[PDB]
Ligand binder design. Structure first.
Ligand code: HEM
Ligand code: HEM
Ligand SMILES: c1cncc(CCCNCCc2ccnc(-n3ccnc3)n2)c1
Ligand SMILES: c1cncc(CCCNCCc2ccnc(-n3ccnc3)n2)c1
Ligand SMILES: C[C@H](O)[C@H](O)[C@H]1CNc2nc(N)[nH]c(=O)c2N1
Ligand SMILES: C[C@H](O)[C@H](O)[C@H]1CNc2nc(N)[nH]c(=O)c2N1
Ligand SMILES: [Zn+2]
Lengths: 411, 407
């Protein structure tokens, strides 16, 4: 079966054969589409086919499919599975695996960079302090004084599901959120529940608007422990505007390193529940969602007042007007401080090219339109006009429950 | 099987049961989602009629009544006899209002029950069609106080006698390809503008020429008619800040009227069913004006605002886009022509969703189309999970007439 997708701005039509290799399910059926839905222990029984499928891919990519090296490896893994009920990836397979999980992440607009990924192997890690050290080295490496480099650190895989390694933070670097008695919120409202856990676990919160959260790290299924990332490793950027000099007085800043720490990496049926990764920001992640979402810092009003916009009628488009200036401020500040950042035009144009390339060389590129299209100025970026097919390939990054809902506390 | 939708801005959860009535197919599978793809006999007929009549009678609280049973019989008899059947006016109105109600891509459905339905099933000729459309235009425009309407021409018989309006909208500007290589007017209409000429139109080769109507009746060859100018309400576009804006020469029309869709009610097919509402500002300002394959005016407006167009990172496209849309809304409001902004419209849709979940058990919605083409995440619908599925009665796409017409 072949499937065609069309760009309605250019008439470019592409054909997808890659989707045939999709094993996992979408959430959709023939009768219902769940394309806008946010969220729609393993036996030796099912593991070897998963291993084999992965190893077949890997050996295909290195042009050694069917080789003695390939056959010996399948044999080796098989034996290790029945002998030990799991198996260990080689370094080469781990690296390939991580790169491909990124490559397959249909919700990531940054995938043109997929092949340049620094993979840190932390599978020898045994304790939380061990985890802290690895994470520090990641932040410092990835930050690179503002010249950001993509990186992932991979802690040991799941065994019985009772010995999981987990980073409890959703991102390595994030600001604290504090619910006040008057019901208002100080800092980032998205982080209120997690900030509370930290305080309870002993964190002394400065109780400000931009407090870098501590790391809460769980190793080997034990209770998580707290660590403060050395401030000198946390690159931040004060936000100012190129024309509005009152903008700096809003007291806004953000961190330079966007690093996701709550996902699960699946490779060959192995489950890596602690696999923090980082790239660099598309400006709208900060300027639109982080600053302007009603349920985040929500600075649209304050910025609008200061701009002297007509805020009496929505049809003045005061919100839209302020939104643009804020996103200009973000891009300006980051570029001025020589911290890597990409605007949503540059990023989406690059993704289209990436995508077209992926159709030629690979037969497809799974992509989630709902997430690929930027949260402002959608139709004046080329991805809006691009039909996309969403499906799930492995290796992949998956969601997993927040560990505070699942953890069995030792005490 | 009982699905939940979450709003991630408000944490509100609604439960969807209505999807368990969906009959038609989505294009998606369990292996692959096609949510962003634009276009994914007597024995056939009676169950279709039955499903419809059942819901119609259920809606009027006479489910399983004698009237219900009788009608069911009567229609069954007619189909068995004539191979087709005819709707009672009451059914027709219901069907059309419900086609709208079920239109998953339409943000304006809170209005769904206030739809003027014009029964034009007695129409026989293209002139007759022209008369009905002018009447529709005048009624719906209403000197700028727009009112929703649909006019419904006779249903398909044997597909040889289809009524079709060839235009995609009752009111659109012409598009001409130049020796220059560039395009004058509306590029989306370049081809249609051609078939107008090839069939007889005397194009004034302007930038904003209201296209003629190309009406096909009873499967016959289609004919041209010029809508009376005084019935086409237009709005000159000015900005409440930039005096230079007027000098761009921009205007748009007030009446947004889709004419190329197929209305399906109880198995019957209405291939000519033009309908109209009123514009959401972004349809004109973002899409019509700023799409590359449309009027593509961003570069010009940017130059006029004197922005640094050297780097994409200055967000000059974004800055211009907002101003343009401010202008669009300003102009319509100034001339008292109904228009709604993306904020109010989406706010209203969220409300309509809450009502539809509460009074009907769901509301099919296509997030890809409901979220506006600008400022997406600062409208509430961005943060709203939506389930998409096809209920009937429905509006469906259908092939462009020139690719099907037996000349
Ligand atoms: C290098 C620059 C990168 C850019 C500009 C970029 C861009 C983005 C953006 C804008 C999102 C949407 C985030 C959201 O709205 O929640 C995203 C999501 C995602 N990215 Fe990237 N990305 C980059 C690097 C990476 C890397 C290095 C990885 C993994 C190795 C990755 C994997 C993912 C995944 C798995 C998601 C989905 C996360 C979720 O579902 O919550 N990206 N990316
Ligand atoms: C009265 C106020 C109305 C508003 C504000 C409104 C809004 C919209 C918008 C913004 C779209 C997207 C169109 C596009 O991007 O191409 C749309 C599409 C649509 N609307 Fe409405 N609409 C209104 C009235 C109506 C009426 C009266 C009907 C039918 C009786 C209707 C049925 C539809 C359908 C079927 C579509 C999808 C058209 C397509 O797929 O090309 N709408 N509407
Ligand atoms: C559900 C509901 N409401 C909100 C959410 C947030 C999803 C988080 N997506 C990841 C966002 C993020 C942050 C930092 N970096 C990156 N990142 C890094 C590389 N690629 C993406 N992504 C989920
Ligand atoms: C599929 C594939 N390639 C291109 C298209 C264009 C879709 C046009 N949709 C209708 C746009 C429109 C115009 C005027 N009025 C209205 N309208 C009126 C009431 N509701 C919507 N919609 C569809
Ligand atoms: C309900 C809807 O799917 C949800 O708000 C999505 C929409 N698109 C998104 N797109 C990105 N990039 N990130 C997001 O968090 C979301 N949220
Ligand atoms: C490929 C994609 O489906 C296409 O660009 C869609 C996106 N969303 C849309 N949304 C609306 N309201 N109207 C459109 O024409 C489109 N086009
Ligand atoms: Zn789908």
């Amino acid at each position: 079966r072949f499937l065609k997708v069309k760009n309605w701005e250019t008439d470019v039509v592409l054909t997808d054969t890659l989707h045939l290799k999709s094993t996992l399910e979408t959430g959709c059926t023939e009768h219902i589409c769940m394309g806008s839905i946010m969220l729609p222990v393993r036996t030796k029984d099912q593991l070897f086919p998963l291993a084999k499928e992965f190893l077949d891919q890997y050996y295909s990519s290195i042009k050694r499919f069917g080789s003695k090296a390939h056959m010996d490896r399948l044999e080796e893994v098989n034996k290790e599975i029945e002998s030990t009920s799991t198996y260990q990836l080689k370094d080469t397979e781990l690296i390939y695996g991580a790169k491909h999980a990124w490559r397959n992440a249909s919700r990531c607009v940054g995938r043109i960079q997929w092949s340049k990924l620094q993979v840190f192997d932390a599978r020898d890690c045994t304790t939380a302090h061990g985890m802290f050290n690895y994470i520090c080295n990641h932040v410092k490496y990835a930050t690179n004084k503002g010249n950001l480099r993509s990186a992932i650190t991979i802690f040991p895989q799941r065994t019985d599901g009772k010995h999981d390694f987990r980073v409890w933070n959703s991102q390595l670097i994030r600001y604290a959120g504090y619910k006040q008695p008057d019901g208002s919120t100080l800092g980032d409202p998205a982080n209120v529940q997690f900030t509370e856990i930290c305080i309870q676990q002993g964190w002394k919160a400065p109780r400000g608007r931009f407090d870098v959260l501590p790391l809460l790290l769980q190793a080997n299924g034990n209770d998580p422990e707290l660590f403060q990332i050395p401030p000198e490793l946390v690159l931040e950027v004060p936000i100012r505007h190129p024309k509005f000099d009152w903008f700096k007085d809003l007291g806004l800043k953000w961190y330079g390193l966007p690093a996701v720490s709550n996902m699960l990496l699946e490779i060959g049926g192995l489950e890596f529940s602690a696999c923090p990764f980082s790239g660099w920001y598309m400006g709208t992640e900060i300027g639109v969602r982080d600053y302007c979402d009603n349920s985040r810092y929500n600075i649209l009003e304050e910025v609008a007042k200061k701009m002297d916009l007509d805020m009496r009628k929505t049809s003045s488009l005061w919100k839209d007007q302020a939104l643009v200036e804020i996103n200009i401020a973000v891009l300006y500040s980051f570029q001025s401080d020589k911290v890597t950042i990409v605007d949503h035009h540059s990023a989406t144009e690059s993704f289209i090219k990436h995508m077209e390339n992926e159709y030629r060389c690979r037969g497809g590129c799974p992509a989630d339109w709902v997430w690929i299209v930027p949260p402002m100025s959608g139709s004046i970026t080329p991805v809006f006009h691009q039909e996309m097919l969403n499906y799930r390939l492995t290796p992949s990054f998956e969601y997993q429950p927040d560990p505070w809902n699942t953890h069995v506390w030792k005490g």
